[PDB]
From a paper:
To test this hypothesis, we performed single-particle cryo-EM reconstruction of the proteolytically deficient mutant MtaLon-S678A incubated with ADP and the model substrate α-casein. The pentameric assembly forms a left-handed open-spiral structure. The open-spiral pentamer forms a large gap between the protomers Ob1 and Ob5. The pentamer forms a tensegrity helix triangle (THT), consisting of three overlapping LHs from Ob1, Ob3, and Ob5, forming an interlocked, letter A-shaped structure that tethers together five protomers. In the pentameric assembly, only the pore-loop residues, Tyr397 and Trp431, of the protomers Ob1, Ac4, and Ob5 are accessible to the entry gate lined by Tyr224 and Met217 residues. Notably, they are scattered along a right-handed spiral trajectory.
Author numbering:
A (entry chain E): 200 to 496
B (entry chain D): 348 to 595
C (entry chain E): 596 to 774
D (entry chain C): 200 to 298
E (entry chain D): 249 to 298
F (entry chain A): 348 to 447
G (entry chain C): 348 to 397
The structure:
C-alpha cells in the first residue's frame, strides 16, 4: 500500500507536470494569437504599400526585377500563404532603403574639425585620426569613398558617451546615425543571419538598421564589436572581412544575403574596447585611434 | 622532395615571398595560419554531427582559391601545439609528403582529395619547437631582419609607396631619404617591418589631413625636420653612437 | 611600502601593498602569475639582490640574505609592462631603508643599474591612474618634461608633478622623512 | 465591450494557431512516415556494409562479441548524434585492424 | 545543389557521395541540424576546386 | 608554568608516561617527531610558491583528530637549525603562548 | 627475454637498421614517434564514451 500511495504521489506529479506543459503551450499560442493580431496589417503594408515604397525606392532595375520576380511569384492569395514572409522579410529593407536619398557627404575635413571640437572639447587625439580618416576617406586608391584600408576601430574604456560620438560625427558627416546589437549577441542573426529558408535566420542588425532609414549610405554602428563571438561556428569572418572589402562589399552576400546586396556607399564604423577578446581575421582593415576619457573632475 | 621552411620572425616578408612565387608561377596564393592550434579537431575535421561542426583549415584554404593547384602557405607551423589530448603533428606529417596525401580526407569530410599536384610552402618561425619527425625532409632557412639600408629600401621602394597610395597621397606628398632615415634610425625598432607600416601610416594620413586642409603647396615635403610634426616624438635615439662611453 | 605603479590593461590602478619587515635569506616568493618576459626578468631579479645591494644606499648583506612577507594585491599581476618584478625590489628597498612612504605622494619611473630614472611610459595613463584614484603629488622622470604638455589640460589641474632625476631622488620623493 | 471583442479575436487567433500547429506537426509525422519507408533505408546500407566487413574479417570471438554489442548500439541515429558517430568510428576501427 | 555538383566535375564515388548526402537533404530544411548541417556539407563539397 | 618536558634515556620512558597521562585525562593522544622537521614552513604553513603549498604539520596533527582540545605529545624539541627561512623554533614559541 | 632497444646519436642509422631487418624478415616496417607524450590515454586509448 506504500507502493500504491507512491503510485498516487507520482501520478499527481506527472499530472501536474503535463498540466504545466499544456499551460505553457497555451501560453505560447496566446502570444501567437496576440502577436498575429497585426499580421494582416503587415500583409497590407507588404502588398500595395510595399509596391509603392519600391517605386519611391526606385531599386536598380536588377534589384527591382528581383523584387518583382519574387513578388510576381508571391502574387496570389495573401492569406493562408507564406508569400507574405518572403514578400516582407527580404523586401522590407528593399522598400526601406530608397536609392533616391543618401547622407550628404562632408568633403570638408575642416567642417569635421569644428563639429568634433564640441564632442567634449575636441579630445585632441580622437579628432586628429578621425580627420586623417576623413581626408583619406575622400582621397583613396580610387580617390573616392572606397576603403581597401582600415575604417579606424576604437580601443579604450567604454565609459564615454560613444553614442554622442557617433552622433557628433554623423553630424560632422551629415550621416544618419544608427545603433544595433552586434557585440555580446552570440548568434548569426543580428550579424549575418542565414539563407532565407528558416526563421531565426534573419536580416542582420546591420540590415535592420539599414531598414531603419531610407538613405543608401547610413552609418551602422557595429555595436561593441570587441565582444564579438557567435555560438554558430563557421566564422562571420567571411561576413566581416567581406563587408570590410568594398570589392566584396558591393558584392556583399552573407549566409542570409542570398543576393549580393549593393552595399557600396554604405559606411560602417568599428568599435573595440578590449584588447584580447578578438577573433584573428579582423587583424586587417582595422586601425586604432586614441580616445581620451575622463578623470574624476 | 623536401618542403621549404622559412623560419624567422614575423614581418620579414615570408608570405609576400609566397605571393611573389605565385606570381612567378602564375598560380593563385593563399595562407592559413596554424598559430595557436591545439587539437586534431580542427586540422582534420570535427566529425560532422551538429551546426557548429567544421572542416579543416586546409579545406577552407582550398575553398578560398578557386584552383586545384594553388601555392598554400602553411604559416606558423611552429606555433603548432598540443596542450590537450590529440597530437596533430602526425596530421601535418601525412599532409606534407607527396605519396600519402594523394587521397587526403579530413574527419569532417569523407572525400579523398588529391593534393599531390598542389605546390606547398610551409612557414614557421623557429624550428626548435617543431616536432622532430616533422623536421625531417625539409629545408631550414632562417630569414633575417634587414639592414637599415635594406629597410629604407623596403620602405622607399616597396612600402612607403603603398602607404601613400592607400591614402590618396599619390604625387601630392613627397617624402625624402632623410625622413625615412629618421623613420628607421630615429623611430622604429623591431624585427619585421610590421610596426613600420603603422607609424608610417600615422605620418601618411596626417599628411593627407594636411593636404586636404588646403593644397597651398601641391608638393608637401616631409623631410626629417617635420617628422615629429606628422608623427609623434623620436622615442629612440637617432644613432647608437650617442649614448655615453661606458666604463665596463 | 612603495608606489610601484603599474597600469592595468583594463581600467587603471595604483599598485601597492602593505609591507612587513621579516628579513633573513634571499627567498621573497610570490605566485604572481607573471608573464614569461617578467619570468626571465624575475630570474634576473635573483641576482639583482647582488645588484640592488650596490646601486642604492642599501647595505651589502642584501646580496643574498633578505626575506619578508609580500602580498601583491593584483593576483593578475601582468599589466603589460616590466612594472611587475621591480615592485618587490622597490618594496624591499623601502623596507631595508626602514623608514616609511609619503602620504598621498606616489612615484613612478623606470629603474636602472647606473642610478637614473628612465621616463615611464603612458604619462597620460599613469596620470589618469594617479588622479582618478585621488593622489595629487606626482614623481615623474626628468625626460617627461616634454611629455607633460602632451597630455590634455583637464588631467593635471589638481596634479603637482615633482620631477625626479635619480632613483635616490625617488627615495627622497617617496621616503617619509627628509632624507 | 471593445475589450470583450479583443479577447474574442484573440481566442479566434489562438484557435488558428493551434490548428496550424497540429496541421504542420501532422505533416512532420507524415514526412517521417514516408521517410523511414525509404529515406532512412538507404543510409542503413552503409551499416550493412560495415557489418559485413566486421563479419568477414576473421576475428577472435571476444572481438566479435564486443563488435556486435557495440553494433547494436549503432542501430540509432548518429548523423546529428555525436554519441553514435563515435560508435561508427569504433566499429570501423575494429574491422580495419588485422586479426 | 544537384546542378552545381553536376557541373563541378566529381569523382564518381564522390559524385555518389554527394548524391547520397543530397538524399540526406530533401527531407527537412529547417530547425535542428539535420539537413541544414548537411546543406553546409554539400555547400563545402561544391565550392572546392575539382 | 611547565608542560613537562621528558628527557633522559632515548626511546625509553617518555612516550609511555605521556600516553599514560592521556589515558588518565581521557584526551586523544597524538605524537609528532620533529627531528627531521627543521623548517618553519613545516611548523606553520608553506608559503605558496607552486601548486601544492602545504600547511604546518601541527594542523596535520589537528587534521588527524576531531577536536580542538586533546593532549598532544611533541617530540625532539631540544635541537634547532636555521637551514631555511628563519627558524622553526619561533613558530613553535608562537604555538606555546596562549594569545599567539 | 628482451625486446631489442636501440640507443645512439640522432642522425645515426637506426630506422635504416629497422627497415633492413624488415625487408630481411619480409616485414612491413613502420614508425611511431613518442616525443612529448605525457598522457597514458593518447598512446593506450582515450576514453571511448565521448
Ligand atoms: N617504568 C616503565 N614501565 C614499563 N615500560 C617502560 C617503563 N619505562 C620505559 N618503558 C618502555 O619505554 C618505552 C617508551 O619509550 P619510547 O616510546 O620508545 O620513546 P621515548 O621514551 O623517547 O618517548 C615504552 O615502549 C615502554 O615499554
Ligand atoms: N650510415 C648510414 N647508412 C644508411 N643510411 C643512413 C646512414 N646514416 C644516415 N642514414 C639515413 O638517415 C635517415 C634517418 O634514419 P636513421 O639514420 O636510420 O635513424 P635516425 O632517424 O635516428 O637518424 C635514414 O633514412 C637513412 O637513409
Amino acid at each position: 500500500l506504500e507502493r500504491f500511495e507512491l503510485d498516487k504521489r507520482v501520478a499527481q506529479r506527472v499530472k501536474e507536470q503535463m498540466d504545466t506543459n499544456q499551460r505553457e503551450y497555451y501560453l505560447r499560442e496566446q502570444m501567437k494569437a496576440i502577436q498575429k493580431e497585426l499580421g494582416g496589417e503587415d500583409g497590407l503594408s507588404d502588398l500595395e504599400a510595399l509596391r509603392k515604397k519600391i517605386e519611391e525606392v526606385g531599386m536598380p532595375e536588377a534589384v527591382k526585377t528581383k523584387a518583382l520576380k519574387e513578388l510576381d511569384r508571391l502574387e496570389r492569395m495573401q492569406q493562408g500563404s507564406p508569400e507574405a514572409t518572403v514578400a516582407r522579410t527580404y523586401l522590407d529593407w528593399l522598400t526601406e532603403v530608397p536609392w533616391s536619398k543618401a547622407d550628404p557627404e562632408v568633403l570638408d575635413i575642416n567642417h569635421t574639425r569644428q563639429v568634433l571640437d564640441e564632442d567634449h572639447y575636441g579630445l585632441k587625439d580622437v579628432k586628429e585620426r578621425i580627420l586623417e580618416y576623413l581626408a583619406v576617406r575622400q582621397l583613396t586608391q580610387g580617390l573616392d569613398v572606397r576603403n581597401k584600408a582600415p575604417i579606424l576601430v576604437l580601443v579604450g574604456p567604454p565609459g564615454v558617451g560613444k553614442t554622442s560620438l557617433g552622433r557628433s560625427i554623423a553630424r560632422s558627416m551629415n550621416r544618419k546615425f544608427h545603433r544595433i546589437s552586434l557585440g555580446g549577441v552570440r548568434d548569426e542573426a543580428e550579424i549575418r543571419g542565414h539563407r532565407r529558408t528558416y526563421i531565426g535566420a534573419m536580416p542582420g542588425k546591420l540590415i535592420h538598421a539599414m531598414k531603419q532609414v531610407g538613405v543608401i549610405n547610413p552609418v551602422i554602428l557595429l555595436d561593441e564589436i570587441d565582444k564579438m563571438s557567435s555560438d554558430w561556428r563557421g566564422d562571420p569572418a567571411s561576413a566581416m572581412l567581406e563587408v570590410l572589402d568594398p570589392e566584396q562589399n558591393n558584392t556583399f552576400t552573407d549566409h542570409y544575403l542570398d543576393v549580393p546586396y549593393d552595399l557600396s556607399k554604405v559606411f560602417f564604423i568599428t568599435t573595440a574596447n578590449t584588447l584580447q577578446t578578438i577573433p584573428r581575421p579582423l587583424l586587417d582593415r582595422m586601425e586604432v585611434i586614441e580616445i581620451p576619457g575622463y578623470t574624476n573632475m | 622532395a623536401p618542403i621549404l621552411v622559412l623560419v624567422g620572425p614575423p614581418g620579414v616578408g615570408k608570405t609576400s615571398l609566397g605571393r611573389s612565387i605565385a606570381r612567378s608561377m602564375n598560380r593563385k596564393f593563399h595562407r592559413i595560419s596554424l598559430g595557436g592550434v591545439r587539437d586534431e579537431a580542427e586540422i582534420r575535421g570535427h566529425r560532422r554531427t551538429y551546426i557548429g561542426a567544421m572542416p579543416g583549415k586546409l579545406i577552407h584554404a582550398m575553398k578560398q582559391v578557386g584552383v586545384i593547384n594553388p601555392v598554400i602557405l602553411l604559416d606558423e607551423i611552429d606555433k603548432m601545439s598540443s596542450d590537450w589530448r590529440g597530437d596533430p603533428a602526425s596530421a601535418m606529417l601525412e599532409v606534407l609528403d607527396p605519396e600519402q596525401n594523394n587521397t587526403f580526407t579530413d574527419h569532417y569530410l569523407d572525400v579523398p582529395y588529391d593534393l599531390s599536384k598542389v605546390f606547398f610552402i610551409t612557414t614557421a618561425n623557429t624550428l626548435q619547437t617543431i616536432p622532430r619527425p616533422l623536421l625531417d625532409r625539409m629545408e631550414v632557412i632562417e630569414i633575417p631582419g634587414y639592414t637599415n639600408m635594406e629597410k629604407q629600401a623596403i620602405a622607399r621602394q616597396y612600402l612607403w609607396p603603398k602607404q601613400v597610395r592607400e591614402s590618396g597621397m599619390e604625387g601630392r606628398i613627397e617624402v625624402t631619404d632623410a625622413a625615412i632615415l629618421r623613420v628607421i634610425s630615429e623611430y622604429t625598432r623591431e624585427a619585421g617591418v610590421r610596426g613600420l607600416e603603422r607609424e608610417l601610416g600615422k605620418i601618411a594620413r596626417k599628411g593627407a589631413k594636411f593636404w586636404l586642409e588646403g593644397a597651398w603647396e601641391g608638393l608637401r615635403t616631409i623631410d626629417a625636420s617635420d617628422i615629429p610634426t606628422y608623427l609623434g616624438i623620436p622615442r629612440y635615439r637617432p644613432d647608437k653612437a650617442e649614448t655615453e662611453p661606458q666604463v665596463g | 611600502t612603495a608606489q610601484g605603479l603599474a597600469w592595468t590593461p583594463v581600467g587603471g590602478t595604483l599598485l601597492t601593498i602593505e609591507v612587513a619587515a621579516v628579513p633573513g635569506s634571499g627567498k621573497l616568493s610570490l605566485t604572481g602569475q607573471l608573464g614569461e618576459v617578467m619570468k626571465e626578468s624575475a630570474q634576473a631579479a635573483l641576482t639583482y639582490l647582488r645588484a640592488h645591494t650596490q646601486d642604492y644606499g642599501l647595505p651589502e648583506d642584501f646580496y643574498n640574505k633578505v626575506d619578508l612577507h609580500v602580498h601583491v594585491p593584483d593576483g593578475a599581476t601582468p599589466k603589460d609592462g616590466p612594472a611587475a618584478g621591480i615592485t618587490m625590489a622597490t618594496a624591499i628597498a623601502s623596507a631595508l631603508s626602514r623608514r616609511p612612504a609619503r602620504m598621498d605622494i606616489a612615484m613612478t619611473g623606470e629603474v636602472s643599474l647606473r642610478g637614473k630614472v628612465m621616463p615611464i611610459g603612458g604619462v597620460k595613463e599613469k596620470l589618469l591612474a594617479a588622479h582618478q584614484a585621488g593622489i595629487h603629488k606626482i614623481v615623474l622622470p626628468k625626460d617627461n618634461e616634454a611629455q607633460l604638455e602632451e597630455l590634455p589640460k583637464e588631467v593635471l589641474e589638481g596634479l603637482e608633478i615633482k620631477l625626479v632625476e635619480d632613483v635616490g631622488e625617488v627615495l627622497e620623493y617617496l621616503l617619509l622623512p627628509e632624507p
